[PDB]
Design a protein around this ligand. Structure first.
Ligand SMILES: Nc1ncnc2c1ncn2[C@@H]1O[C@H](COP(=O)(O)OP(=O)(O)O)[C@@H](O)[C@H]1O
Ligand SMILES: Nc1ncnc2c1ncn2[C@@H]1O[C@H](COP(=O)(O)OP(=O)(O)O)[C@@H](O)[C@H]1O
Ligand SMILES: [Mg+2]
Lengths: 63, 461, 577, 44, 577, 120, 120
C-alpha cells in the first residue's frame, strides 16, 4: 500500500512536468511570429557559426 | 546546441571509428542514430587528431555508412541522481523500465567516481549480524566492508545473498549505544541474470517489502553485453550518493562479477591488447579495484557502504583470474563448497577457505562478547583437525584409530550437521556462540589451547 | 538494393567493394549464381560478407547484391512434418529438384506456396488488431494452427476474405492502412520475438526417462544441458526426449552431427505415435538438420532458425520442446568465422563474445503469457560435446552459468553399457523445490520425501563404495552390505533404461513412483528383518527381489494390480524370516 | 601411479596449450609492429 | 620551456607532438588542468607522455608544457609523521583543499613553507664543505634531524644564519660561489644517492617475531622478500614489522593495495609507543600510499619516492626500514603502460626490462658508511604477490635471485589459523653465517648450535612426514613418534605467534632462546628416557609441556624466573620416571 | 571417390579400409600450418573436425540403389588414451568403435580385442 | 677468452668457475625480448642451446699442446626440478653433474653434496 500511494504520487507529479514541457514546446513553436525573430535566429546562427570554426554551408528553411 | 558527425569509417564488433572528430573528448558519451531514427549509446575510448574509436553500448545490427550520425552528449559520462529513486528500477544505461516517469535529477555525478581519500576514511568498525552462523561467529561481516561470496556453478549463492539482504541487522545493545534502528537501503546491481534468478530476487524483496528502500539496476542476459561495464559504476554512484550525502546505510549486492570480467575480456580482445592470465586484459586489476574500493565509511560523517559481490568461480577454484583478483582487492571472502551442498547443507560455507580481514576491528570485548575471537580460533583449529583426519580415515581405515582421534571425527560431522546447517532460521550471535560452546564441549580440556582459562572455566558444558 | 563486386575471396569470406550504405547483418546474394551471405565489418565502402554455402570456383568481378533485409525466417502453416537446413530450405524439395547430392545455389521457398489450406476467420470488419492477436485458424493435421498478426503490426481491420480454402501467399486480411496480412509472415531471426510477461515455470517437462524426471527434473519453462564424450550415448537420449514427451511440438535442431541420426529420425517417425492424440509422431516434429559435411557457417544460422520457429509455436499456445544437438559445433563455427575474420581469441580459439551468444540462445526459453493473451512455454535441451571428459572447457563452463539443469554423462559408466550414462555424482537440477506442489497433487502425497530418501541412499552407497573397494567385501558388518545391495538394485532396476524395449522406453510418473515404493519398502522391511538376527546373505536370494527386478517391464495398463501384488509379496515374503 | 601420471600429462598438455596461445599472440603483435612501420612508409 | 599539443589520448597515454628537444623522463604538464606526465619514447617530434592521473575529459589540442627536469622529490625536514602519494604530495593538505575525494591536478608542496623550525648551526664561516657534510641541526619529534649539503655541491662557506627559528625556504648557508644552501634539496628518484662505502652485514634487523628472527634472520643491511597468496597474511606481517622493529624510521610504501589497510595504519599508530624512543609511533613513520583506484601509472613513481626518502634518512646516520608491499602491482603497472607502447613483451606480458628495474631497486639497500662520516642502513622488505598463488612467476623468479631472506607464505597453514604462516620447506635465509658473532655475544653462547638443533629436528620431522602420510601414525617406533610430537610442539609453541594478543607480539630473543632451550632439554631427556624405555603416552601427558605451551603467553618482564622454574620442573618431571 | 563411383553407379558393396588416421591428421597439421590459423586442443588445426567428417560422412547407403560404402578407419592412439584429438574427433563422428587392447596382447592372443570398450 | 688464451699460448692449466648460469639465461631472454624476437620453449629463446653450447664447449684439452681449460658452471635450479630448460640443456651439454642437496644442508653438513644423484 505504501508503494501504491508513492507511485501514484510520483506519476501525478510527472505528468504535470510533462504538461509544462507541452506549454513551453508550444510557446517555442509560436515564436516565428514576433518582431525579434530575425534577431534571435541570426543570434543562434552566429552561435552555431562560432562553435564550428570556419563552416562552409549553412542550411536554413525556405521560410 | 547539438553538433553532429557523419563519416564513420569502420564498424565491426562493438567498435566504430568516426573521423574528423577532434571535439569528441576522451571518455565522452556519444549517441548513434541510423536511418530508422533509433538511437544507441556509446562511449569514446580513443581520440586522435585523425579519428576516434567508439564502443557501442547496444547491439550493432542495422548500422550503415551512408547515414548514422554520431552526436555528442555529456562531456564526461554522468549519471543524474536524485533521492527519489529509492523504489525504482533501471536498465544498464540508467533509464526506468517500470512505466513510471523519468526522475528529476538533483545532482549529476561522474559515473566512474573519484578515489576516496585515505586520510578521510574511518575504520569499518560496527558489528553486523547476518543470521548465518558461520558469518556471525567465524567470518564476521562488519559494516563498511567488501566481502564477495565465491560460489560454484550450481551452488545457492543467490539465496545466501537474499538471506543477508532480508535479515542483516546491527545490534547496538552489545555495542553500547542504541541510538536508533534505521535499516539498510539495498542497491541491487544485476549483470546478466536469466529471469530465474531475477524472479527469485524480485519475489524475495517483494515478500519482505524491501522494494520501498532498494534501487535495482537490472541488466538481463539478453540485453547487450557492453553495458555490463556501465552497470556497477552507475550503481555505486548512487551508493556513494545515498551514503555520503544523505546518511543512509547502503548495502550493495553486485551480482555475478564474472559477467563484468567477460565484458572486459570482450572489449579488451577487440582492442588488440596485452593479455594477463587466461586471456583477460592487463587493466582488469585496476577496473575491479575501481569498482570494489568505492566502499567503506568516512571520517566525520554518518553513512556506510557494504559490498557483497557475488562470484561464479569458473572451475570452482581460487586460481582463475576473476576470483583471484577479486580476492586480492577485497577484504576477505566467503566461499561455498560443492561437498556440503551434495551432503544437503544450507548455507554450504566451508570456513577453511573463507576469511574476513576486518573481523578484529568489530568483535570482542564490549562489541560482541569476551570470548568471540578465541571461540573462532578454536573452532578453526578443531575443524581443521577433523578435515585432515578424514583423509587419514580414507588412507588407513577407521579401526586403527584411538579415541581422541575419533573425537575430532565426531566434532567435524557434528559441526557440519548442527553449526553450519540451518534452514532459513535467524540464529543470533548469542545463540550461535551457545551452539559453538555446545560443540566445543565435545572436546576435553588440554585440547583447547586457544581459549583463556576463565572463559573455559565459566562457559564450558 | 546496394550492388557491388567482389574485391577479395578468403575461405568462405567474400570481401566485396562498392557497398556504401548496406546495413550490417543484412543478407546479400553474392556471386553471379545467387549464393547467400551475411554482411559484417563495414570499412570505407568495403563490406565483409560471409557465405553460407560453399565458395569454390568464384572470381573477382562477380556482382554482389544487397537485399537490404536481415536473416528472416518465414513463419506460418506447413512447417510441422518437415525437414530444413540452416537457412530454412526444405530438403525434400531439394531432393526432388536436384538429386541425391546437396548442390550449391538453389532457391526453393521455405513454406510450400501451392497447398490449399482451409481458412476460418476470427475477425470481422470494423475490429481492431494488435501485435500477436489471432486472425483465424487453419486446420493443419489434428492441431488447430491459429495464425498471428505480426508482432510489429497493429491497426484497424478493413476487410476479411471469407471462409473457404486458400494458399499461404494469398493476402487474407486487409487493414485500414493499405497493408495486407498474409498467412505466413517473415521475422528477423536474431531479434527475439516479444512477450507480454514472463511467468515462473511450475509444471514439469515429462521426458519418459526415469532418472531425468525423478532425480533431476526440468520444468516446462527451463533449460537443461547434456554433456558427454563419445560412446556415452547422448543421441538416444535426445531422440528419447523427442519421441516420448508431453510437449505439443518438438523442434529438433541438429547443428553439426552425423546424417545417420537424421535419417533415423526421418524414416522411423511416421511409424510411431505420440501418447496424446494418436496419429503419427512425425506430425509434431519440425527438424532442422545440418549435417557435418554441409557447410560450416550454416551451423550458426541453424540454431537461430530453430529457436525462432520454437518461439513461433510458443506464441500460438503450444508448449514447445527444442532439442539443440552439438552446440559445441556451433562454437567451432563461431571459432572458424572469428579466426577467418582475424580477431584475437581467448581460451582456445573461441571468440570472447561466446558466452554472450550462448546466453542469447538459452534466454529465449521460458514460460510466458503471449501477446494474444494465452499462455505458452518453450524448453531447451542442449547437447554439448566437450573434447574428452573435460568439463573445464570454455563452452561447457560458459553454458554452465546459465542452465537450470545439468545432466552429466560418463564414459566409464557407459563402457559397461549402462544406458543412460547419467552420473548422479555431479549432475544437478534447480527445479526440484519449485515442482513440489505439482508433485503433491498429481503423483502422490509423500513423493518429494520418497525421492529424498532415494537420494540419501544413493549418496550413502557412493560414499561407502570407496572403503568397499579398499578393504574388500568382508569387513562391512550387517546392514552396510544391505546398503550396497539396495544401491545395486536401484542402479540396475530404477536408473537403467533400455529405450529399445517396447514398454521400458516410456515410463510415466506412476510406474516410477511404484518402483521407488517397492525398493524403499523392501529396504525398510529388510532392515527390520536384520535388526533381529537374520543373515544378510540369506535375504539376497529371496524371490521377491526378482519381482522387484523385472518390474520395469510390466506395462502402463498392467501396472497397478501388479504393484499391489508385489506389495503383498514384499509383506508376506519376510514373515518366514 | 597411473592416476598421478594422468594428472601430470593433463597438466603438461594444458600448460603447453597456454604457451602456444601466447606465442601466437606474440607473432600477431609482431605483424602489427611491422605493418605499422611498413604500411605508413608509402602513404606516410 | 618547450611547447606542444596533445595528439592522441588513450587512458594513461597522451602522445604529444610539437615537442622536439624534450628529454626522456622529464616531467611535463598535460592539458589546461596541469596534469603531471612523464615522457617515454620520444620520436620524430612527438613524445609518449604517460600521465599520473586519469585523463577523462581531456580533448586533443590542449597544450603540453615540458619542464626539462626529471622526477624530483623534495628532501628536507618535515617528511616524518606524513602521508604522501606517488608524486610526493601530502594527502592531508589535499583533504583540506578538496572534500573527501581526491581531484586530479591539485598542486601542493611536499614540505610546509610556513612552519618555523629551530636552526642550530654547526659550521663556522670560511669552512670547506663537500656533498654530504652536515651543516646544522633541527630537533624534530625528538629526533635530531640533520641538514645536509646536497651531494655534488661543493665549496667554501661565506656566511651562516645564526641560531634561531627559520623556515625551509630561508637560505641557511651562503657559500662563496654565490650558491645558497637551504634546508631542503630536490633530488631525482632514479639515481642512487652517492655514498662513501658499502659495508658487510653484522647486525640483525630485529623483527620481533620468533620464526623470522631465530630461523630466518635478516641482517640490517639486507633485503628480504615475503611472498604468499591472498589470505596468507603478508600485510599484517608487514604492519607488525612496522610496529615492533628496531629501526629508526620506517618507510611504509603502499604500492597498489587497498586504502582501508592504510587508514588502519594512520589510526592505530599514534596511540602506540616507539620502543627505542619514548614517544609515539606515527612520529617515526613516513607513509607513501598509492591505493588501488588511485591512478595506475603513479605506482612506479610511488615505489621510487619511498626508496629515495629511505636513502635520505640513510644519509643522516639513522637505520631505516622500508616495507614495500605488492611489487607485482608495480610490475603490472609497467605492463599496463607497456600495453600502449605496443612494445614486444616478455613472459606473460611483462616488459623485458622488469628484472633490471627490480635489480636496480633492490640494490639500493645495504649498510653504508655515508659521505657525512656516519654509518647507516636501509633494509627492504618487499611483498611479492603472485597472481595464481604460484611462485614460478616472472616477478617472483626475478625477486628470489637478488633477495636474501626469502619467506614463502603458504595457504594450507593459513586455512587453519596458524600465524605467521611461514612455510619452512621452501623458505631460506643466507645471513645466518655473518650473524654468528653477534648472536654469540648478545644472546647467549650456544645460540647457533641451538638454532641448528631446532632446524635439524624440524628437518627430521619433515622427513618422517612421508612415512606418517603413507603408512599411518602407528607402525612407527617410539623414538620417531617422539620426533614427530616434539616437532609438532615446536610448530605450536615456538613458531606460532598471534599479532593481536597484548603479550606475544613483540618477542625479544631472550624469550626465544628460553623457549628453544626448554624444548631441547625436554627432547634430550625424553629421548634418554625413551631409550631407557617407558611408554610414550606416559610421556606426552605431563603437566610440563602445558607449561611449555603457555610459556609464550607469559610476559617478557618476569620471564627469566619463569624460565628457571621451567628448567627445574623439566628436570623434576623426568626425575620421577 | 572411387568407392562412391562403384557403389552408386554399378551397385557394388564397397568396403573401404583407411588404415592410418594418425598419419592423415599429422599431414593435415603439417600443411594446415601455413595459412597462419590458431590451432586446437593439441596442435592440430581448428578445422580438423570438418576435415575428418568430409571423409567419414561419404559412407552410408542411399535408397533406390542397392549399393553401399561401408568404412573401416584404423587409427593408432599415439599414447594409450581416448582423450587425444584424433580418437575423440573420430568417435564423435562414427558409428561406434572397436578397440584393441594390450592386456590381450601380452598374453599372446591375436586379434587382441577386448569387447568391453567396443560397441556398434 | 682470457682462459683459452692463457691455456693455449702459455700452456697453463686453467680452472674456470662460472657463477649463476641462471642469471645469464634470464638476461638472454631479456635481451631477446628487447631485440624483438619470439620466445621459444618456456619463454626462453629458441637459439638458447647453441648460444649456451658456445660458452660450454670452449673447454677441453688439445692434442699437441700442454694447456687445459677445465670448466665448472654453477647454476641455481629455478624450482629444484631438472626438467626446466636451463639445467636440462646444461646437463644435456656437459659431462655429468654434481648436485647440492636441500636436506643435508638444513640438517647441517658442509658441503652438502649427496652422491646419489651426482655423476661424472
Ligand atoms: N602475524 C599474524 N598474527 C595474527 N593474525 C594474522 C597474522 N597475519 C595475518 N593474520 C590474519 O590473516 C588475515 C589476512 O591478513 P592480510 O595480510 O590482510 O592478508 P594478505 O596477506 O592477503 O594481505 C588478517 O585478517 C589477519 O587477521
Ligand atoms: N583496431 C583497433 N581499434 C582500436 N584501437 C586499436 C586497434 N588496434 C590497436 N589499437 C590501440 O591503439 C593504440 C595505438 O598505440 P600508440 O599510437 O602507441 O598509443 P596512442 O594511440 O595512445 O598514442 C594501441 O595501444 C592499441 O591498443
Ligand atoms: Mg595484502
Amino acid at each position: 500500500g505504501e508503494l501504491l500511494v508513492a507511485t501514484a504520487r510520483t506519476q501525478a507529479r510527472g505528468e504535470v512536468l510533462e504538461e509544462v514541457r507541452r506549454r513551453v514546446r508550444e510557446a517555442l513553436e509560436a515564436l516565428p511570429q514576433k518582431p525579434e525573430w530575425p534577431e534571435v535566429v541570426r543570434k543562434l546562427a552566429l552561435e552555431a557559426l562560432e562553435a564550428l570554426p570556419g563552416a562552409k554551408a549553412l542550411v536554413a528553411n525556405p521560410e | 546546441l547539438k553538433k553532429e558527425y557523419t563519416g564513420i569509417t569502420y564498424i565491426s564488433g562493438p567498435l566504430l571509428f568516426v573521423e574528423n572528430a577532434k571535439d569528441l573528448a576522451y571518455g565522452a558519451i556519444v549517441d548513434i542514430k541510423d536511418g530508422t531514427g533509433r538511437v544507441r549509446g556509446g562511449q569514446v575510448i580513443e581520440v586522435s587528431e585523425e579519428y576516434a574509436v567508439i564502443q557501442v553500448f547496444e547491439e550493432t545490427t542495422g548500422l550503415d555508412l551512408a547515414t548514422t550520425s554520431v552526436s555528442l552528449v555529456e562531456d564526461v559520462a554522468r549519471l543524474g541522481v536524485s533521492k527519489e529513486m529509492l523504489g525504482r528500477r533501471f536498465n544498464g544505461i540508467g533509464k526506468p523500465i517500470d512505466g513510471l516517469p523519468p526522475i528529476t535529477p538533483e545532482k549529476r555525478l561522474p559515473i566512474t567516481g573519484l578515489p576516496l581519500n585515505p586520510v578521510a576514511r574511518r575504520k569499518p568498525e560496527q558489528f553486523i549480524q547476518t543470521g548465518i552462523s558461520t558469518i556471525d561467529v567465524m567470518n564476521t561481516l562488519v559494516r563498511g566492508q567488501k566481502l564477495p561470496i565465491f560460489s560454484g556453478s550450481g551452488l545457492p549463492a543467490n539465496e545466501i545473498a537474499a538471506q543477508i539482504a532480508r535479515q542483516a541487522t546491527v545490534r547496538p545493545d552489545l555495542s553500547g549505544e542504541g541510538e536508533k534502528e534505521e535499516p539498510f537501503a539495498v542497491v541491487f546491481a544485476a549483470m546478466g541474470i536469466t529471469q530465474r534468478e531475477l524472479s527469485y530476487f524480485i519475489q524475495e524483496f517483494e515478500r519482505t517489502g524491501a522494494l520501498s528502500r532498494s534501487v535495482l539496476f537490472l541488466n538481463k542476459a539478453d540485453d547487450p553485453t557492453i553495458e555490463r561495464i556501465l552497470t556497477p559504476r552507475m550503481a555505486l554512484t548512487v551508493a556513494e550518493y545515498l551514503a555520503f550525502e544523505h546518511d543512509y546505510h547502503v548495502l550493495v549486492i553486485l551480482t555475478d562479477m564474472t559477467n563484468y570480467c567477460e565484458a572486459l575480456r570482450e572489449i579488451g580482445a577487440a582492442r588488440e591488447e596485452i593479455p594477463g592470465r587466461r586471456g583477460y586484459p592487463g587493466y582488469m586489476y585496476t577496473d575491479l579495484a575501481t569498482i570494489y574500493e568505492r566502499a567503506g565509511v568516512v571520517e566525520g560523517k554518518k553513512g556506510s557502504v557494504t559490498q557483497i559481490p557475488i562470484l561464479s568461480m569458473p572451475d570452482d577454484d581460487r586460481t582463475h583470474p576473476i576470483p583471484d583478483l577479486t580476492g586480492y582487492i577485497t577484504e576477505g571472502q566467503i566461499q561455498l563448497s560443492r561437498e556440503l551442498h551434495r551432503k544437503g547443507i544450507y548455507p554450504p560455507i566451508d570456513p577453511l577457505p573463507s576469511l574476513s580481514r576486518l573481523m578484529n576491528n568489530g568483535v570482542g570485548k564490549g562489541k560482541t562478547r569476551e570470548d568471540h575471537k578465541q571461540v573462532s580460533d578454536q573452532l578453526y583449529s578443531a575443524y581443521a583437525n577433523g578435515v585432515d583426519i578424514r583423509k587419514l580415515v580414507a588412507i588407513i581405515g577407521e579401526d586403527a584409530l584411538t579415541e581422541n582421534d575419533r573425537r575430532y571425527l565426531q566434532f567435524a560431522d557434528a559441526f557440519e550437521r548442527f553449526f553450519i546447517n540451518q534452514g532459513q532460521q535467524n540464529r543470533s550471535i548469542e545463540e550461535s556462540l551457545q551452539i559453538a560452546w555446545a560443540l566445543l564441549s565435545m572436546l576435553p580440556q588440554g585440547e583447547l589451547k586457544r581459549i583463556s582459562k576463565d572463559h573455559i572455566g565459566k562457559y564450558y558444558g | 538494393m546496394i550492388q557491388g563486386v567482389i574485391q577479395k575471396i578468403a575461405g568462405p569470406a567474400v570481401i566485396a567493394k562498392g557497398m556504401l550504405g548496406a546495413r550490417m547483418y543484412d543478407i546479400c546474394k553474392v556471386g553471379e549464381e545467387g549464393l547467400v551471405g551475411e554482411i559484417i565489418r563495414l570499412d570505407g565502402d568495403t563490406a565483409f560478407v560471409q557465405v553460407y554455402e560453399d565458395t569454390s570456383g568464384l572470381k573477382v568481378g562477380e556482382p554482389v547484391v544487397s537485399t537490404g533485409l536481415p536473416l528472416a525466417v518465414e513463419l506460418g502453416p506447413g512447417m510441422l512434418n518437415g525437414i530444413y537446413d540452416g537457412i530454412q530450405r526444405p530438403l525434400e524439395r531439394i531432393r526432388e529438384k536436384t538429386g541425391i547430392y546437396i548442390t550449391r545455389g538453389v532457391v526453393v521457398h521455405a513454406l510450400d506456396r501451392e497447398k490449399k489450406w482451409a481458412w476460418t476467420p476470427m475477425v470481422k470488419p470494423g475490429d481492431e488488431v494488435r501485435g500477436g492477436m489471432v486472425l483465424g485458424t487453419v486446420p493443419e493435421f489434428g492441431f488447430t494452427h491459429k495464425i498471428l498478426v505480426p508482432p510489429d503490426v497493429r491497426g484497424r481491420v478493413k476487410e476479411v476474405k471469407p471462409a473457404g480454402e486458400y494458399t499461404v501467399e494469398e493476402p487474407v486480411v486487409v487493414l485500414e492502412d493499405g497493408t495486407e496480412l498474409k498467412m505466413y509472415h517473415t521475422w528477423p531471426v536474431r531479434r527475439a520475438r516479444p512477450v507480454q510477461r514472463k511467468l515462473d515455470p511450475n509444471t514439469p517437462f515429462l521426458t519418459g526417462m526415469r532418472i531425468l524426471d525423478v532425480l533431476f527434473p526440468v520444468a516446462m519453462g527451463g533449460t537443461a544441458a547434456i554433456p558427454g564424450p563419445f560412446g556415452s550415448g547422448k543421441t538416444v537420449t535426445q531422440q528419447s526426449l523427442a519421441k516420448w514427451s508431453n510437449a505439443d511440438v518438438v523442434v529438433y535442431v541438429g547443428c553439426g552431427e552425423r546424417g545417420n541420426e537424421m535419417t533415423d529420425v526421418l524414416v522411423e517417425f511416421p511409424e510411431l505415435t505420440d501418447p496424446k492424440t494418436g496419429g503419427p509422431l512425425m506430425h509434431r516434429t519440425v527438424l532442422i538438420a545440418n549435417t557435418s559435411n554441409m557447410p560450416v557457417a550454416a551451423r550458426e544460422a541453424s540454431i537461430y532458425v530453430g529457436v525462432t520457429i520454437a518461439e513461433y509455436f510458443r506464441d500460438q499456445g503450444f508448449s514447445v520442446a527444442l532439442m539443440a544437438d552439438s552446440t559445441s559445433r556451433w562454437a567451432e563455427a563461431l571459432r572458424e568465422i572469428s579466426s577467418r575474420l582475424e580477431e584475437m581469441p581467448a581460451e582456445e580459439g573461441y571468440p570472447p563474445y561466446l558466452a554472450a551468444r550462448l546466453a542469447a540462445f538459452y534466454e529465449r526459453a521460458g514460460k510466458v503469457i503471449t501477446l494474444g493473451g494465452e499462455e505458452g512455454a518453450v524448453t531447451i535441451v542442449g547437447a554439448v560435446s566437450p573434447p574428452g571428459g573435460d568439463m573445464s572447457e570454455p563452452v561447457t563452463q560458459s553454458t554452465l552459468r546459465i542452465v537450470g539443469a545439468f545432466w552429466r554423462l560418463d564414459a566409464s559408466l557407459a563402457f559397461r553399457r549402462h544406458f543412460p550414462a547419467i552420473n548422479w555424482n555431479g549432475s544437478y537440477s534447480l527445479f526440484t523445490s519449485a515442482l513440489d506442489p505439482w508433485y503433491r497433487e498429481n503423483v502422490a502425497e509423500d513423493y518429494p520425501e520418497l525421492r529424498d530418501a532415494i537420494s540419501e541412499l544413493l549418496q550413502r552407497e557412493a560414499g561407502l563404495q570407496e572403503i568397499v573397494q579398499l578393504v574388500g567385501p568382508d569387513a562391512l558388518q550387517d546392514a552396510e552390505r544391505l546398503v550396497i545391495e539396495v544401491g545395486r538394485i536401484i542402479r540396475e532396476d530404477f536408473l537403467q533404461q533400455n529405450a529399445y524395449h517396447e514398454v521400458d522406453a516410456y515410463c510415466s510418473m506412476k510406474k516410477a513412483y511404484g518402483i521407488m515404493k517397492m525398493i524403499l519398502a523392501f529396504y525398510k522391511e529388510a532392515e527390520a528383518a536384520i535388526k533381529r538376527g537374520v543373515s544378510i546373505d540369506e535375504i539376497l536370494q529371496l524371490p521377491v527381489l526378482e519381482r522387484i527386478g523385472r518390474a520395469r517391464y510390466v506395462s502402463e495398463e498392467e501396472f497397478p494390480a501388479y504393484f499391489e501384488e508385489a506389495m503383498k509379496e514384499i509383506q508376506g515374503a519376510f514373515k518366514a524370516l | 601411479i597411473p592416476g598421478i601420471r594422468a594428472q601430470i600429462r593433463f597438466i603438461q598438455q594444458v600448460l603447453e596449450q597456454r604457451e602456444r596461445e601466447d606465442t601466437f599472440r606474440l607473432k600477431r603483435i609482431k605483424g602489427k609492429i611491422e605493418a605499422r612501420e611498413a604500411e605508413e612508409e608509402g602513404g606516410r
